[PDB]
């Protein structure tokens, strides 16, 4: 109850590396660099749960 261990990044690369955040909805992990996350965000969401501009 709490775990999930799902690496769903825009990378398309299933790899737990670097600093990763948890998408509040789908409870995945994603690399801060690609999603452009701030780590100090109130609640982070992947581009699937909440479409955000991704220029990578």
């Amino acid at each position: 109850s709490g775990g999930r261990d799902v690496i769903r990044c825009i990378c398309g690369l299933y790899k737990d590396e670097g600093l990763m955040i948890q998408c509040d909805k789908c409870m995945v992990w994603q690399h801060c660099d690609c999603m452009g996350v701030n780590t100090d965000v109130e609640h982070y969401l992947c581009e699937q749960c909440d479409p955000r501009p991704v220029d990578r």
């Binding site: 737990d16 590396e17 670097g18 600093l19 990763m20 955040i21 948890q22 992990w29 801060c32 996350v37 701030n38 780590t39 100090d40 965000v41 109130e42 609640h43 982070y44």
Partner: peptide
């Protein structure tokens, strides 16, 4: 934003 940092290129295995 729960931040789990798992860098595993050279330093990803403690002890």
């Amino acid at each position: 934003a729960r931040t789990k940092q798992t860098a595993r290129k050279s330093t990803g295995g403690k002890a």
